[PDB]
């Protein structure tokens, strides 16, 4: 039965709450990219051992936080050895404004998953996005999503 | 064992060759959106009965052909009844120029799959894109991709 | 003093109201892509004679309506002769749901303008998007935008 | 007569050569985001005093380098006071592979410009992209682009 990892950055702690919600649904372990865009070696090992990787980031100035992208750039290492090929991926984001820009962040997360040769799990539209504490409605859709990713990861392990 | 459908539009017949290649890899049936953006009732029934749906379209003026989008718009019908929820999706495109714009077409295809609540299969980056007859290199990567989608569709049926 | 054209498709008539609003701000003439994705020869002549072209379309299944894209595809003709090079462009969209997808439609409109070698006028974020009659708040931001495009088109004629 | 600033990040120095080329065409000053995503106070002052801002970044793992995005995120400061409203913007990118992903980087640069309420100058498609020293063909198209941005910035000052 599946091992899902939620790897996320929070600037301000709203994407932290959404990650807890997704972790709860997927019964995932949580790994935090720090304020400097760094993940511990425990995080990276967990990602290489996961059946599913769910990416979390704020949308800031129209895209994923620089801290998330620094982590994405550093996944060039697992990418060159195809360590994450065929894993199940999902994502989430949350900002203070328009789902406008949030779709851009989600679309990057899909590209990052594709670059790694993974399978992308859509919301059961592309992935959860949310307004910025946070409404229970958003936390609930987030939690359902995490359960939906774990589910695919089980079927597809 | 899985039923994959390749549903595609070709303006000029280069995306037709790429579809045959993907169909060969997935051992799929082929269904053509006509020059007016119409799919037969046989096509639509096949899509509702498929384990995997692979979308094919030219990239023209920076996006999917109008004929493909007319078909996408008409999939609002299966979308309202969630007929394609949890199906496995992939895509492909081909134009006469820059993979520039082709990524935009592929990204639409991912959105269309997400809108339907499907799972997206990346190239084993997001999906095959090709230059515009067509090189064997592109046809081969296309065929491998179709085999890779069928494979996921089998595991995940 | 500048000639702005608003060229738009409305499925259902909500993007028609938004176009009237943008036309009012820019003091533009209005040209409608019909239900079949066709523009009159009067429309096409007006576009070739405009200092500014503002594109209007619904967001449907995650992108511009097929009728808008059919028109975009047909602008391949003015594109091959570079008829619209250096013109000032803007856009707008409106749907029944998430500004999620609406950003995708706006981003296509930017690509279409770029393909034509035009200059893109942002909202004074990328262009107006709106919920779907329609709120006065949205109509007002739309009208301000049309005045802002005409303004650039005057400066930059 | 116009003041254009080229503000760029280079990982590896290929986007540095492209920036020199754009600077040459626009007769711009050059300002480098360092390896840590930091711009000097001289850079930021230059950006606030520019008639045109041209953004330069590598495409890495499917998007702008983390160092570029850290700079973009830090432009939240000029953004809150609308310091860059109505400025003329352009962009460029260069990677070792598919113009696939490069369009995504360019599209972010357009969003960043829009967020700031600027005008976007397309290649006279959206902006220059290039393969990765670098071919003279790419450097030349880049230089022409920088001249084309300065030109708009003069007209539109």
Q: B40 φ, ψ to 5°? A: -70, 170
C-alpha count within 13 angstroms, C-beta hemisphere, residue D108: 35
How far is CA D112 from its chain centroid?
10
Cβ of D66 within 8 Å of Cβ of A60? The answer is no
Q: What region does A96 belong to: left with phi over 0, alpha with psi -120 to 50, or beta?
A: alpha
Q: What region does A152 belong to: left with phi over 0, alpha with psi -120 to 50, or beta?
A: alpha
Q: What is the DSSP string of D2-43?
A: --EEEEE--SSSHHHHHHHHHHHHHT-EEEE--TTS---HHH
Cβ of D125 within 8 Å of Cβ of C111? The answer is yes
Q: What is the DSSP string of C77-128?
A: HHHHTTTTTT-EEEEEEEESS-HHHHHHHHHHHHHHHHHTT-EEEPP---S-
Residues near C5 by beta carbon (within 8 Å), at least 6 away in sequence:
C28, C29, C30, C31, C46, C47, C50, C52, C53, C54
Do D65 and A69 meet the contact criterion of CB atoms below 8 Å apart?
A: yes
- Identify the CATH number of the domain defined by range B1-157: 3.40.50.360
Residue the block writes with tokens 């790694």: A116
- SS3 for B81-126 is CCCCCCCEEEEEEEECCCHHHHHHHHHHHHHHHHHCCCEEECCCCC
Q: Which residues pair with C32 in a beta bridge?
A: C8
A contacts of D61 (beta carbons < 8 Å) = 69, 72-73, 75-76, 79, 112, 115
CA nearest neighbour of C53 among C140, C115, C120, C107: C120
Residue the block writes with tokens 């089980």: A154
CA nearest neighbour of B53 among B74, B21, B29: B29
Report residue B129 as tokens: 């894109």
Report residue D21 as tokens: 């080329």
Among the partner-chain residues A69, A76, A107, the one whose CB lies closest to the CB of D69 is: A69
3-state secondary structure of D86: coil
Would you list the domain boundaries of chain C?
Answer: 1-157
Cβ of A125 within 8 Å of Cβ of C99? The answer is no
How far is CA D67 from its chain centroid?
13
Distance CA D95, CA A90 (A): 26
Report residue B86 as tokens: 């949890």
Residue the block writes with tokens 């116009």: D2
Report residue C114 as tokens: 């770029």
Q: Which residue of D has its CA nearest to A114?
A: D62
Do B107 and D107 meet the contact criterion of CB atoms below 8 Å apart?
A: no
Q: With 0-12 CB in 10 A as exposed, 13-18 as middle and 19+ as buried, what is C152?
A: buried
The H helix count followed by the E strand count for chain C is 6, 7
Residue B149: C-alpha distances to residues A92, A117, A122, B22, D117 (Å): 25, 12, 16, 9, 43
Report residue A30 as tokens: 């949580």
Distance CA B61, CA B101 (A): 8
Report residue D65 as tokens: 């380098």
Resolution, rounded to a tenth of an Å?
A: 2.3
Do D94 and D130 meet the contact criterion of CB atoms below 8 Å apart?
A: yes
Do A53 and A7 meet the contact criterion of CB atoms below 8 Å apart?
A: yes
Distance CA D90, CA D113 (A): 8
Which residue, among C98, C104, C137, would best test binding to A if mutated, counting the most A CBs under 10 Å from its CB? C98
Cβ of C155 within 8 Å of Cβ of D155? The answer is yes
Q: What DSSP state is assigned to residue D123?
A: P
**Helices A136-155 & A14-26 angle (0-180, nearest 10):** 40
Which residue, among D92, D96, D103, would best test binding to B if mutated, counting the most B CBs under 10 Å from its CB? D103
Q: D119 φ, ψ to 5°? A: -105, 135
3-state secondary structure of D75: coil
Parallel, antiparallel, or unpaired for β A63-64 and A88-95?
Answer: unpaired
Distance CA C66, CA B36 (A): 11
How far is CA B128 from its chain centroid?
10
Cβ of B101 within 8 Å of Cβ of D103? The answer is yes
Distance CA A22, CA A29 (A): 10
D contacts of C121 (beta carbons < 8 Å) = 119
Distance CA D110, CA A27 (A): 38
CA nearest neighbour of D47 among D100, D94, D113: D113
Residues of chain B with a CB closer than 8 angstroms to some CB in chain C: 37, 60-67, 69-70, 72-73, 75-76, 79, 101, 104, 107-108, 111-112, 115
């Amino acid at each position: 039965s599946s091992n899902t990892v939620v790897v996320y950055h929070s600037g301000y702690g709203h994407t932290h709450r959404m990650a807890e919600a997704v972790a709860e649904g997927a019964e995932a372990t949580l790994h935090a990219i720090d304020a400097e865009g760094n993940l511990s070696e425990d995080g990276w090992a967990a990602l290489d051992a996961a059946d599913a990787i769910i990416f979390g980031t704020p949308t800031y100035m129209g895209g994923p936080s620089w801290q998330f992208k620094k982590f994405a750039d550093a996944s060039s290492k697992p990418w060159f050895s195809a360590k994450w090929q065929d894993k199940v991926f999902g994502g989430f984001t949350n900002s203070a404004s328009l789902n406008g820009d949030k779709l851009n962040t989600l679309q990057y997360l899909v590209l990052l998953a594709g670059q790694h040769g993974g399978l992308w799990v859509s919301l059961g539209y592309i992935a959860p996005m949310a307004q910025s504490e946070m409404s229970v409605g958003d936390l609930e859709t987030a939690r359902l999503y995490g359960a939906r990713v774990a589910n695919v990861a089980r079927q597809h392990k």
